[PDB]
Amino acid sequence: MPIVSKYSNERVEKIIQDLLDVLVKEEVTPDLALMCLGNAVTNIIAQVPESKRVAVVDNFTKALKQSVLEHHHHHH
Amino acid sequence: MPIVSKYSNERVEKIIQDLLDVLVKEEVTPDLALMCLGNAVTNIIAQVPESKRVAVVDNFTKALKQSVLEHHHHHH
């Protein structure tokens, strides 16, 4: 329900950017990016206790679909 | 196109490695990692045509939950 503000947003978006930098440094393809990122995500989720391990990945995948569909929400 | 993969698995792993190096040098938490990676993936899927955008994100998310449940032990 509430989006936790545990960390500085600047830092959050910066890390996102630095990750994108890696992807643009190699000029990776969409397929490649998804495959590399997917393994990175899974690695982190494996470090999360099993009790919530299935929950965190599901919420991840759920929210992922939410953000993708909101790109043409009220734009052309 | 005469492409079955194009990119070498060696490079694929190396990219994942570098992505990990990014996350490690930032000392990211599970919360932060998923939050940053989610936006990164979303931007990648935003480069994918809407004609297949829902397909790629669904297979991505599908493969994620597969990997999470599959990867308890290494594999071999």
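Chain B has one domain: 1-76.
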